[PDB]
Amino acid sequence: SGFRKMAFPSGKVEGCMVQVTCGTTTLNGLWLDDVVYCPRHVICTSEDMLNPNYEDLLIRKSNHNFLVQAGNVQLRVIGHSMQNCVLKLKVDTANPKTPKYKFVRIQPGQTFSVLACYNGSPSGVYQCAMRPNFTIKGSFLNGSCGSVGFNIDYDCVSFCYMHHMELPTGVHAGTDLEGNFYGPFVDRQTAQAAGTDTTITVNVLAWLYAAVINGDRWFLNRFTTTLNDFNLVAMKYNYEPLTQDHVDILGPLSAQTGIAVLDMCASLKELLQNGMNGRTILGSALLEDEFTPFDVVRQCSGVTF
Amino acid sequence: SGFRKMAFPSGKVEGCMVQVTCGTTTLNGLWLDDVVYCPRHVICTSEDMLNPNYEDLLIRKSNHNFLVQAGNVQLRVIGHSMQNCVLKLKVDTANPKTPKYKFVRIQPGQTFSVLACYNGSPSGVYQCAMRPNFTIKGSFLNGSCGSVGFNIDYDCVSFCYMHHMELPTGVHAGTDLEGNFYGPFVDRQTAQAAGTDTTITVNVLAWLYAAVINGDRWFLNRFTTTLNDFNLVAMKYNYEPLTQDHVDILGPLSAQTGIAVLDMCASLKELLQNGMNGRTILGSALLEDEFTPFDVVRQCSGVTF
């Protein structure tokens, strides 16, 4: 019983975090086998970030200009290259704590855990979602760049995010571990405005199934709807349109609870049109959209790693 | 920028989790140096839990009746004793991953991280508070008993909670690592009802300071109050009374923001009397009370471990 914002256990990732220093800039790197991945803006000064030419700035850097420390363990840089917006630093020593891993590029609406780090040292772990406008609502201070987001499946760490930028609106932008930004964001200090922060409808439905499994049932009504009728309502409230692919993914939660997906959509329609009347669901006074269907099944079934 | 429910990095605790089996009961244990700590109800069947006599049940158990596995690592039990509601199993091998640690008994209102485990394997990590009625609002399924709560201070893991029971209302009860229950709860399946779940006033004020640091400022008003006038209002809304000790702990957040503690209390008074008018603070539509003053300073200053 109970439903919490639950992060993956962070130990497999903690063992991969290092400090990367270039001149007077220090941030975090990820040490996997004999490669350290970090944001390419490690090579920039504050002035450089207004309009950086990364190819030109990197010409002035040699292997010996990159200082990499794994706790107190000095790692020797024997090669460097730029891949999109990340630097790959080849080091002399394979990380002995390298977990089984893959690099994945996640879709908007997918959730992950963030290990917030400073100077190569873990600070804390929390759950995030890739927003539909390709930002994340993180918690990141100066020095957190190169902190990573991940999922775990049994023995395997899937890295999906590396932190690069805070936007002036205080939301966060970053890359996959191939160094491609999520969304239209760039690693320069310019006018970059985020698009509409739309609600992840399939996640809200997953969380209402979690509420029913936990005994919060007041919002169940005698109504049903259709995908097209529900979607007229989703549009008005800046919800993502619901697709048959979404209905199919909610199948297992439907089967476990005996509540048809379109009946749960009718329950969500009434919540959107009438509000919550000062009531709570799983201790929230708002509709929560940072739990996936998989997240709900995992927490409600006790899956381990 | 940003404020999240942030757990401590879990790796130092992951390395301490083991599986303990006694007859047909499996739960989690904590392996520190050459001792495994686990709930004494590992020795009970389902029928035993209605009215267990732990001294009598333990007479039928020898060292060889306790099976302890650290992943695939079989640990040999060379002694056992009961301390309050925990069993101490002496094993032949010191855990090589033992962190610097202490056992602390926490006060109501203090927060901690939980590493939810099943069969000795970590599932997830989340932040909890000890409620004023000595329950926690966790996320625990069958098999989670012996999962632990902790804080980290630099190199040192402070263990404060071991999970034992779910109450019929679906909230959670447990012990310190000396095996003394928080509050009046006992390890038997009986009528145990929780007292009033009162709101932790000092934590709500800490979180309003966090909101101001992050630019959410709409709730700041032109009012002040006194401790006695505020406390008349706290009582009506089932808030904990605010003491001068609480005002003193909020001193650093007051100094950082230039907002007097009694001015922030006047802001909280108006929120309690008038509600939030459908507005949000740090992405919440309710007043959040599971962040301590120390938690806010830690997240707002980037403290590492």
Q: Which of A126, A170, A275 sits opposite B7 (nearest CB)?
A: A126
Q: Which active-site residues of B does the annotation give?
A: 41, 145
Q: Which active-site residues of A does the annotation give?
A: 41, 145
Query: Checking DSSP bridges between strand B35-39 and strand B172-175, what pairing results, if any?
Result: unpaired
Are B43 and B54 in contact by the 8 Å Cβ rule? The answer is yes
Residue type, A203: N
Q: Tokens representing A215?
A: 């005994």
The distance of B155 to chain A (nearest Cα, Å) reads 11
Of A51, A39, A21, the closest CA to residue A83 belongs to A39
Asked if the Cβ–Cβ distance from A11 to B15 is below 8 Å, we say yes
Q: How far apart are CA A222 and CA B21, in angstroms?
A: 47
Are B124 and B86 in contact by the 8 Å Cβ rule? The answer is no
Calculated CA dihedral for residues A179, A181, A185, A188, nearest 10 degrees: -10
The distance of A8 to chain B (nearest Cα, Å) reads 5
Asked if the Cβ–Cβ distance from A121 to B7 is below 8 Å, we say no
* Closest residue of chain A to B285, computed from CA coordinates: A285
Residue appearing with tokens 């209390």:
B265
The distance of B31 to chain A (nearest Cα, Å) reads 17
CA distances from A1 to A73, B102, B140, B284 (A): 43, 29, 6, 23
* Closest residue of chain A to B215, computed from CA coordinates: A170
Are A140 and B1 in contact by the 8 Å Cβ rule? The answer is yes
Q: Which of A7, A119, A285 sits opposite B125 (nearest CB)?
A: A7
> Which of A3, A8, A10 best tests the B interface by mutation, with the highest count of B CBs <10 A?
A10
Asked if the Cβ–Cβ distance from A170 to B214 is below 8 Å, we say yes
Of B301, B123, B249, B33, the closest CA to residue A303 belongs to B123
Asked if the Cβ–Cβ distance from B139 to A4 is below 8 Å, we say yes
Are B179 and B83 in contact by the 8 Å Cβ rule? The answer is yes
Residues on chain A touching B123 (C-beta within 8 angstroms): 6, 9, 298, 302-305
* Closest residue of chain B to A71, computed from CA coordinates: B305
Q: Residue B216 belongs to a domain with what CATH number?
A: 1.10.1840.10
Are B186 and B192 in contact by the 8 Å Cβ rule? The answer is yes
Range(s) of the domain holding residue B220: 201-300
Solved by what technique? X-ray
Calculated CA dihedral for residues B59, B64, B68, B73, nearest 10 degrees: 170
Q: Which of A116, A284, A304 sits opposite B118 (nearest CB)?
A: A304
Q: Residue A64 belongs to a domain with what CATH number?
A: 2.40.10.10
> Count of alpha carbons within 13 Å of A171, Cβ hemisphere only?
19
Cβ contacts from A onto B, under 8 A: 152
Residues on chain A touching B171 (C-beta within 8 angstroms): 2
Residue A290: CB atoms within 10 A of its CB come to 20
Asked if the Cβ–Cβ distance from B137 to A166 is below 8 Å, we say no
Helix (H, G, I), strand (E, B) or coil at B277: coil
The resolution, in angstroms to one decimal, equals 1.5
Q: How far apart are CA B158 and CA B102, in angstroms?
A: 5
The distance of A148 to chain B (nearest Cα, Å) reads 13
Q: How far apart are CA A187 and CA A190, in angstroms?
A: 9
Asked if the Cβ–Cβ distance from A5 to B126 is below 8 Å, we say yes
Helix (H, G, I), strand (E, B) or coil at B296: helix
The distance of A101 to chain B (nearest Cα, Å) reads 17
Burial class of B89 by CB neighbour count within 10 A (0 to 12, 13 to 18, 19+): buried
Greatest distance between any 2 Cα atoms in chain B: 69
